[PDB]
Design a protein around this ligand. Structure first.
Ligand SMILES: CC(=O)Nc1ccc(F)c(C(=O)O)c1
Ligand SMILES: [Zn+2]
Ligand SMILES: [Zn+2]
Ligand SMILES: [Zn+2]
Length: 585
């Protein structure tokens, strides 16, 4: 028994064909089964023919006879159809409201999540269907991971370099960072974990979490997880106040946090607030300063990634008493300078998935662009807070959507928070970039920030762009542009100072070839998010949707403190770069 995900009406029915088995009311179950392929219905029991070796499961071909379910062919003379009167038969028949249209629910229930349109719907439907969609998508993502073949160590060539044998009649996952494996040793009658791993083309390179002397018949699978049901909204109902509520402003604050005093007061005067922090504008400084402005406030700092949490930890360690901080860790190497798993500590740093059920004066949820609606709901379920602050940048990268192949995901569809920030605007904006030369700031100010982002630094004059398509080769899941690397090679010979540069591209394969040819450290745009370097060399590699995506371009060029070389495939983004043009040697 439970609540219908369309009406809320009490019900004894779940759709057995839906992967999350959502409770549907007599009417909503009916409208769902007759307008889709979903015909298996579950109650206290499953609506299936309780006849011996009858296969009939379709509820519309089934009848209650006695206290058992039968099809047409096996039913007793005294029976009634389970599925008639615009209703499916279960408890609480007399309390059932229905809906005008069941169309959004059916689309969520039946879509394969390969098209942007599925995520648009998941983010504009009713709040109750946002949760259904978020569960459904996530269960679908975890199942897609099982669809991948096992990789088995066929030969150890060296340290860090292997030969894999792949399970026949199942696809191989992409060999990039967005696919994290887990090793396993063959035991008497079982298997035991041996740390997570990632692979890249060579033979394959592997950069595992822990170190080992792994040997033949050792195997690797992407760890999939049980997805729990969601209950809490993606956002609590908003409230505006006429005074700061449940918080006590400090009387003395350092001129280090004085720029955020108005913002800090705004946090205290509504239930939740959104802070758009562009690259290098002081998001973690904001987040910790909030503790100093409200010194008695119990604050839970959360984010999706251990790295995002640890960065809040590093910033805390420098401003907050260490004995008032705790890092929550469940039973990967993260931040180890705070007492571990002390929930009742004033300052709690903890990833979304490991959050305890607790209260707080303020919840700071950082790197919000990377959050899914699933994450947003979990936080609301675990943390009852007086104030929620959502910090991030809808102009930066979202969580990879492993299943999305067709269409682009616009930032207003990344999650409910980014939706608000893109529709009504952010509550608070960090308007001054301290990281980047003015050429980069000016470029992205106009590209994605509506000319509201201001440079601290002057022009560097070390910001260059070259228009060069070169030559694109494709391997199994990546792109390579050797001539764009050649242009970088010739540039470096005439500009040896740039040998301190980081190499960035939209493709792991481009990066692997650049690494060998240039010896620069490499990053994907996606892995560079949150990092900064003095000098950046960027090869666009292709002009795909992937490589021209404005959020990815934005992250790519805002990594640079001093200089950047952009080797561009795309005339559009080339013409938007406010950088000195260089001809081709
Ligand atoms: C058949 C197969 O995929 N194997 C396998 C082994 C260990 C695991 F832990 C997982 C897993 O986490 O899904 C999967
Ligand atoms: Zn269904
Ligand atoms: Zn209903
Ligand atoms: Zn039957």
């Amino acid at each position: 028994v439970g609540a219908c995900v369309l009406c809320n009406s009490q019900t004894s029915l779940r759709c057995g064909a839906c992967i999350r088995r959502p409770f549907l009311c007599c009417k909503c179950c009916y409208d769902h089964v007759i307008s889709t392929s979903h015909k298996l219905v579950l109650s206290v029991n499953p609506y299936v023919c309780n006849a011996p070796g009858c296969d009939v499961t379709d509820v519309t071909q089934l009848y209650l006879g006695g206290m058992s379910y039968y099809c047409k062919s096996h039913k007793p003379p005294i029976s009634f159809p389970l599925c008639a009167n615009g209703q499916v038969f279960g408890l609480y028949k007399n309390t059932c409201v229905g809906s005008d249209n069941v169309t959004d629910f059916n689309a969520i229930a039946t879509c394969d999540w390969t098209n942007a349109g599925d995520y648009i719907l998941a983010n504009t439907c009713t709040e109750r269907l946002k949760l259904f969609a978020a569960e459904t998508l996530k269960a679908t993502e975890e199942t897609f991971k099982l669809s991948y073949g096992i990789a088995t160590v066929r030969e150890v060539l060296s340290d860090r370099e292997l030969h894999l044998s792949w399970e026949v009649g199942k696809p191989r996952p992409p060999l990039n960072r967005n696919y994290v494996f887990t090793g396993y040793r063959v035991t008497k009658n079982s298997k035991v974990q041996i740390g997570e791993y990632t692979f890249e083309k060579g033979a394959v390179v592997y950069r595992g979490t822990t170190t080992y002397k792994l040997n033949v018949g050792d195997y690797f699978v992407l760890t999939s997880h049980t997805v729990m049901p969601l209950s809490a909204p993606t956002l609590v109902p908003q409230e505006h106040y006429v005074r700061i509520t449940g918080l006590y402003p400090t009387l003395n604050i350092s001129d280090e946090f004085s720029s955020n005093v108005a913002n800090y007061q705004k946090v205290g005067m509504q239930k939740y607030s959104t802070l758009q922090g562009p690259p290098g504008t002081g998001k973690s400084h904001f987040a910790i300063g909030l503790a100093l402005y409200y010194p008695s406030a119990r604050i839970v700092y959360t984010a999706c990634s251990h790295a995002a949490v640890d960065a809040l930890c590093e910033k805390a360690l420098k401003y907050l008493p260490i004995d008032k901080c705790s890092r929550i860790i469940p039973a990967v190497e993260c931040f180890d300078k705070f007492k571990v798993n002390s929930t009742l500590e004033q300052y709690v740093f903890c990833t979304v998935n490991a959050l305890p059920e607790t209260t707080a004066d303020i919840v700071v949820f950082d790197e919000i662009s990377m959050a899914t609606n699933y994450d947003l709901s979990v936080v609301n379920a675990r943390l009852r807070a007086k104030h929620y602050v959502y910090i991030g940048d809808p102009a930066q990268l979202p969580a990879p959507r492993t299943l999305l192949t067709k269409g682009t995901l616009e930032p207003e569809y990344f999650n409910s928070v980014c939706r608000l920030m893109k529709t009504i605007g952010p509550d608070m904006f960090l308007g001054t970039c301290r990281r980047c030369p003015a050429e980069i700031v000016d470029t992205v100010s106009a590209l994605v920030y509506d000319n509201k982002l201001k440079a601290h630094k002057d022009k560097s004059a070390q910001c260059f762009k070259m228009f060069y398509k070169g030559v694109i080769t494709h391997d199994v899941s990546s792109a390579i542009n050797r001539p764009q690397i050649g242009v970088v090679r010739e540039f470096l010979t005439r500009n040896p100072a740039w040998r301190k540069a980081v190499f960035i591209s939209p493709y792991n394969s481009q990066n692997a070839v650049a690494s060998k040819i240039l010896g620069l450290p490499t990053q994907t745009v996606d892995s560079s998010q949150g990092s900064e370097y003095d000098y950046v060399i960027f090869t666009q590699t292709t002009e795909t949707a992937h490589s021209c995506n404005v959020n990815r371009f934005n992250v790519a060029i805002t990594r640079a403190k001093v200089g950047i070389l952009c080797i561009m495939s795309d005339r559009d983004l080339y013409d938007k770069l406010q950088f000195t043009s260089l001809e081709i040697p």
